[PDB]
Write a protein that binds this ligand. Sequence first.
Ligand SMILES: CCCCCCCCCCCCCCCC(=O)O[C@H](COC(=O)CCCCCCC[C@@H](C)CCCCCCCCC)COP(=O)(O)O[C@H]1[C@H](O)[C@H](O)[C@H](O)[C@@H](O)[C@@H]1O
Ligand SMILES: CCCCCCCCCCCCCCCC(=O)O[C@H](COC(=O)CCCCCCC[C@@H](C)CCCCCCCCC)COP(=O)(O)O[C@H]1[C@H](O)[C@H](O)[C@H](O)[C@@H](O)[C@@H]1O
Ligand SMILES: CCCCCCCC/C=C\CCCCCCCC(=O)OC[C@H](COP(=O)(O)OCCN)OC(=O)CCCCCCCCCCCCCCC
Ligand code: HEC
Ligand code: HEM
Ligand SMILES: CCCCCCCCCCCCCCCC(=O)OC[C@H](C)OC(=O)CCCCCCCC[C@@H](C)CCCCCCCC
Ligand SMILES: *C(=O)CCCCCCCCCCCCCCC
Ligand code: FES
Ligand SMILES: [Cu+2]
Ligand SMILES: [Cu+2]
Lengths: 312, 160, 54, 223, 163, 158, 139, 103, 92
Amino acid sequence: WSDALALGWPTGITPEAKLNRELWIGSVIASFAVGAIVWGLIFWTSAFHRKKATDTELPRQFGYNMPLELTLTVIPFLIISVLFYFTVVVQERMMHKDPNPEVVIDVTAFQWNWKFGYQKIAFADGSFDYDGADPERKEAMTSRPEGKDEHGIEKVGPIRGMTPEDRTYLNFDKIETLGTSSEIPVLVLPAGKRIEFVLNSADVIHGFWVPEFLFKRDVLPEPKANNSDNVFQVSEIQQTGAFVGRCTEMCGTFHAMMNFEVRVVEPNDFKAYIDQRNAGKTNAEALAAINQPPLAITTEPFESRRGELVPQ
Amino acid sequence: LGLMGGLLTINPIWNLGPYKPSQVSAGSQPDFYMMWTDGLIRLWPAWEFYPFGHTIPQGVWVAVGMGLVFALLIAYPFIEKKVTGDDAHHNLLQRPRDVPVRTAIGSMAIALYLLLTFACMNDIIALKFHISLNATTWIGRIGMVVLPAIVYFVAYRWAI
Amino acid sequence: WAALMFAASIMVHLARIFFTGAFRRPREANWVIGSLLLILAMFEGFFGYSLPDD
Amino acid sequence: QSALLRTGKQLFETSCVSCHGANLQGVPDRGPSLIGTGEAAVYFQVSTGRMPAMRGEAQAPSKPPHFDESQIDALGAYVQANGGGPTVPRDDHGAVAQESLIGGDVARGGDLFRLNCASCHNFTGKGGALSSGKYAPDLGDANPAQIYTAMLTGPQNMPKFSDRQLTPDEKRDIVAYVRESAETPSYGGYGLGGFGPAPEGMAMWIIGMVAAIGVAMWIGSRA
Amino acid sequence: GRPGESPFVKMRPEDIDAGGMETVFPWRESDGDGTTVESEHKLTEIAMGVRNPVMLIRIKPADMHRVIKRKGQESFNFGELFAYTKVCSHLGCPSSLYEQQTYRILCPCHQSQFDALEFAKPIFGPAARALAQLPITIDEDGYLVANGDFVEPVGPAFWERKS
Amino acid sequence: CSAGQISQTTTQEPAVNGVNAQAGQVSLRNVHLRAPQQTDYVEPGTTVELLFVAANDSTESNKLKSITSDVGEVTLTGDSTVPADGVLIVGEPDGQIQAVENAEAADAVTAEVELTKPITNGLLYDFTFTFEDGETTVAVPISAGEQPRRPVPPAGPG
Amino acid sequence: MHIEARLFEILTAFFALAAVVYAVLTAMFATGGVEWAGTTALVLTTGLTLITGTFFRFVARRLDTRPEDYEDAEISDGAGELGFFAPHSWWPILISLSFSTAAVGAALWLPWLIAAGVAFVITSVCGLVFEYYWGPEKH
Amino acid sequence: MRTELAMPGLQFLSNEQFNQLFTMHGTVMLLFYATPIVFGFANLVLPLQIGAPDVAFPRLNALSFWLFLFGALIAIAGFITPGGAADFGWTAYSPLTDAIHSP
Amino acid sequence: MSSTQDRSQLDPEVERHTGVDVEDVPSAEWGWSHMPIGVMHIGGLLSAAFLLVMMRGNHVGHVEDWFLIGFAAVIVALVGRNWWLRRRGWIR
Ligand SMILES: CCCCCCCCCCCCCCCC(=O)O[C@H](COC(=O)CCCCCCC[C@@H](C)CCCCCCCCC)COP(=O)(O)O[C@H]1[C@H](O)[C@H](O)[C@H](O)[C@@H](O)[C@@H]1O
Ligand SMILES: CCCCCCCCCCCCCCCC(=O)O[C@H](COC(=O)CCCCCCC[C@@H](C)CCCCCCCCC)COP(=O)(O)O[C@H]1[C@H](O)[C@H](O)[C@H](O)[C@@H](O)[C@@H]1O
Ligand SMILES: CCCCCCCC/C=C\CCCCCCCC(=O)OC[C@H](COP(=O)(O)OCCN)OC(=O)CCCCCCCCCCCCCCC
Ligand code: HEC
Ligand code: HEM
Ligand SMILES: CCCCCCCCCCCCCCCC(=O)OC[C@H](C)OC(=O)CCCCCCCC[C@@H](C)CCCCCCCC
Ligand SMILES: *C(=O)CCCCCCCCCCCCCCC
Ligand code: FES
Ligand SMILES: [Cu+2]
Ligand SMILES: [Cu+2]
């Protein structure tokens, strides 16, 4: 009954998703109760037809029932206040911001595909002395001594001394699981661990959704400069396997082609995968080595052809 | 005229290099008074006839079109008198609203002329106002039979 | 520019006379010669801006 | 250069692998392969900004560049290393040459422009229309390196002018003519755009004819 | 574009590259450079010839398989080189505009497109006759030379045509 | 609606002299012949180089590049099994940068052909590139990579 | 105009409260301090309603109770000379067309079509404003 | 948009043609059907409902309609252009709208 | 008040007793006011025929032909509606 009444909510795979789904079930229960009573009122007053027995006498013509107005304007306030309290306590576990993440994934989301960096891994049980790449971050400070003019301008840069095309906010890593248009990216994560996602976008605002996480976040170009908390954590992921992930914003033409996968494997499988990726190997090769299908099983790559009726 | 000769540049022949058959630009338009003939050339749909061992190019179509335009323009008063029946010595003008059919016909003709004039400019219209060149050509082709009718109806009702 | 204004003003004058009916019974020959004049002006400008081989 | 290649690769991987697939091979029906396009093609296209392209249409429009000169050079070096092809000109220091591309002869440049360029662009480098939604853009924004590289690599529906077809001296002359025609003030007043008949007729009908009609309405009496 | 001296220079297939268009003219060895007075009149005649200018197009080898060929013009092309008259088949303006990756020869005068891939048949605009195709080849030394003459009159059509 | 399923921009080949042959798992890009010709033909018995880039499409590899020979006896000096989700660059197209002082496996799989048949620029000559996956005829062109104009003799009026 | 002014006074009170609370709760408890966009928008919509309400209150104090504001007001009380309401006019469509020609000139960056649309707009606004003041033609 | 979404494939629409459709569908329905028709109903009966003979500025409300009509048309005019209408959704978020994106 | 009424005697010469009437066109006597409906019907039919005939041409395109078909169809529909209504006496 829970699945049917959840209105197509995928049963969460992380405690945050489970709790959010429970809140959704409660909210839908309350909303359906309110809807049932109001629809009952409507279909009941629809029984107050203009009966032919009604002689030349109009109805009571009352209007203006102050006590009833007060009752029906105080009860909704209490209902929404309870909903708001539950919403606040649930939202509290939206990003606990644990200062000790077990694996940090640098989620760059560029124009019409994804890239996952594996910025840092530090298992609480004790393992994975791994880190990201501090180099490769090259600024674009246009601090030339002189511009077109002869002297005096000594222009530093448009914004904070930097040109708009800077990409210093973008952080890079040694292990990059870039997604090609013909090879859907598969971010592999260890099951049972705390996984932090540091979200960034290369070109345009867009979204990052894992329907099984019951949570999405907008990958912004420069979240820190935009006053956005791009980074967000997931306490755990119990269920293993591959879970589709969509882009949940507007990106451009190929916005529906940004589907990726999150493949939750066992911690030992993640050990083997990261070791074999540190060794020169692609994501598909590492998946095959750890004996898991290399290509995204939940979603095939979209046909790069612009449509069915195009003549190939 | 002097102010415009000063302040506005007309026909910069120095920019327009000397004529050479191998060279050409993209504009290639005549002055606005011949722009309607050029637009007729552009819009007319490439209908050529090939009699026994001969060719009848699309140029004849536009030539006959110009001939018809001039013949009708020259012979309108006699056409109008034959149609309506009025040969009375008229010295008092009549407001264009007071003659719905003639003002409607004149509006239709002006609409056709404007359509042809802008068809001749479809190249620059397409370039600046971002509309595909084929779209502009076919807009002209369809309009030169649709727009005159629309303008005729609208002008007739407007006069009434 | 005078050529362009000449053509434009001939066109506007033609519009005026046609719409006000300044051609019927009398002045019909005047309209005829005016039409010839407009055609001549058109081709005159055509030969004019074609005169400097460009 | 090693770091230049690495920077070009990093920019490529997060900019265009969705439509110029990784390995520089083209994504079928999204973008052509960049093997053999060369550094000149990358410089022209990205600097004009056409390449961070967010639609498949009749023509890729120009736009503000998404990369600064250093990143343009990085991407160009990456593409040149992967494919190998034409290279953008450079001056003695190493920066992309701008003034060095101004050919000495301008009459020769204009003749070549009219024979080859004006065909579609204009008498003086204003824009021109093409078959189905395409158009030759105005050249007044392009800088000498951009013009030279545009000739060197036919960007889109534009003939590719090799160095053999147009020796770099001829291309320099054409660049000189383009810049001169673009930066030259209109003698005789405001050149209404660069197209004679159409802007001139509109200006007649709007400026001269409204003036004449308004003056006639002032002088005469409505009735 | 050299002002006056050696205005026309022999040409080689390698000079053009795939997706390239070059305007060429009928130059004879006797019509040497413009230094002499005898020359510079033959050369002026070549330049001013209404039906003289031709456009040589290098069809991209990838798209060479989309080429359709006219009756009697099947061997006219030299490999991937196609020489079509520039003079538009309708009213004779040059068709100088060329769109590569579309292979459309557009005429600026009245916006007529000819499909260069196929024989240059008009696929839009007023033109109704395909552009005449010049037979081309390479002589000794590899220089491009016309392998004959147009099998049809090349300018715009007229009454005495198609026979 | 120039943006529909059939749009000009998307369906455009690269503005490069080399042809593209997508047939087979491995895709051939910018495949051309460096055959500098001093006359009408490149006479038989002269070695000309065969440039191209073989890009692997699938990660599951087709790195064999068995023969890729046709009329001309194309030989692959320094042959290697490069393509694994990557590029095999057989030669150095004009303008190619080595990208590092050293090199891997000496020459990077340079393909050279002893013609045994005249060829000239502007013609298309069929080459059968055969990987273990399959074989494809490519119809390679002749490309003058970056060589400028060869000075034609001045003309003596007659 | 007491109720007309009091409506805007209530809106001003609410919008001032919203602006103040937003500014405080964004200066503290926000990721990057004051938002500076919502804060300014709320402050200046408070200003919008404040200007309107202040003018309405000034007018309410300046004017005696109108029949419209007066309950138990007979129709005859307000019966009289209503002012000039513009009859038929074709200047609004011309103003709209001129502003559309300026707008397309701005969209398609055509300085010449912007310049002309603005001229067009000036001409049509002049026509609309002078419509009922152009004295008889003096010959 | 609905016919295209009936089947998983891209039967007859391209990605950007579809993107133009919900952009213009969203804006046309809101800004050219919903917001201009409240003033359509207001102009219809509001003077009647308060007992007034006409609106305060009856030449102005005439201008409002024509500004709506012509303003609406030039937004629809994106379709006739070869590129098409606005790709970005009705919301028209910032980075996707700048000259770099959706040019 | 500063306006004088106008007296006009224009020379008249069809006598307007058949065709259009002042109730339909107030200035019927002052100028040409009636175009025979057959003229407009035949003009619309020929315009539709011309639009359809323009489909035959040297264009590989197909949206052009479809636009021609649509415009010709609406023209023919308008002409047919007008003719049918006038046949029945302007009913439905
Ligand atoms: C009433 C009588 C008065 C007549 C007007 C007289 C104005 C005199 C102006 C002053 C003297 C002449 C200046 C000549 C210097 C000069 O030429 O002026 C250009 C400007 O040009 C523009 O943009 C236009 C700017 C907008 C202002 C002018 C608009 C006036 C129009 C509206 C008049 C005609 C009426 C048409 C009515 C339209 C509505 C129809 C319904 C400025 O340079 P630029 O901007 O950079 O030009 C680019 C090269 O650089 C670059 O290479 C090249 O490639 C190009 O891009 C070129 O534009
Ligand atoms: C004087 C103007 C008034 C004219 C009045 C007459 C009104 C009737 C207009 C008739 C419109 C005819 C439109 C069709 C025309 C047609 O057949 O062409 C098409 C392009 O469709 C379109 O956009 C249709 C756009 C239609 C919008 C018409 C807008 C009317 C405007 C002009 C009215 C405002 C007038 C302003 C008056 C100013 C007053 C001045 C005082 C396809 O070209 P293409 O681009 O090559 O498409 C290829 C694919 O097909 C192929 O799959 C794919 O592979 C690609 O190759 C693709 O390119
Ligand atoms: C209310 C109607 C609503 C109708 C709305 C439909 C909108 C969908 C249109 C385009 C979508 C993008 C596809 C873009 C590609 C086109 C699809 C295709 O390939 O369809 C097959 C062939 C061409 O084959 P081709 O390969 O293109 O090559 C060809 C030469 N080489 O056309 C056909 O038979 C089928 C016809 C295809 C489109 C024709 C639509 C034009 C106008 C319809 C009516 C206008 C009415 C005006 C009224 C006054
Ligand atoms: C579909 C979106 C798109 C993206 C994003 C894009 N390209 Fe392209 N690219 C194309 C298309 C389509 C063409 C051919 C048509 C054109 O250029 O207009 C092309 C062609 C090119 C060319 C010229 C090819 C030639 O033969 O002249 C270069 C160089 C290039 N791309 C490099 C890049 C670089 C570098 C980037 C990232 C900075 C990039 N592109 C991003 C689609 C794209
Ligand atoms: C009768 C109406 C006339 C019209 C419509 C007309 C039109 C024109 C036009 C548009 C030009 C092009 C000018 C240019 O491009 O700079 C021109 C050139 C010329 N006109 Fe006329 N003209 C007319 C009468 C005359 C007359 C009466 C003469 C001699 C008295 C004359 C002599 C010339 C000359 C010599 C030129 C060449 C100028 C040049 O090449 O720049 N025209 N004419
Ligand atoms: C008979 C005359 C009256 C019309 C009769 C009923 C007219 C009924 C017209 C059905 C039209 C059906 C079209 C089917 C599309 C098709 O299958 O081809 C796809 C093609 C490839 O896609 C396009 O290229 C663009 C398609 C979009 C058209 C944008 C037009 C926007 C108009 C604006 C510019 C405003 C103009 C002002 C117009 C002002 C008028 C307002 C109503
Ligand atoms: C490319 O140039 C345009 C692509 C747009 C294709 C989809 C068009 C949707 C229909 C728009 C309706 C226009 C108004 C109809 C008037 C009757
Ligand atoms: S002159 Fe070439 S199409 Fe008319
Ligand atoms: Cu997305
Ligand atoms: Cu995105």
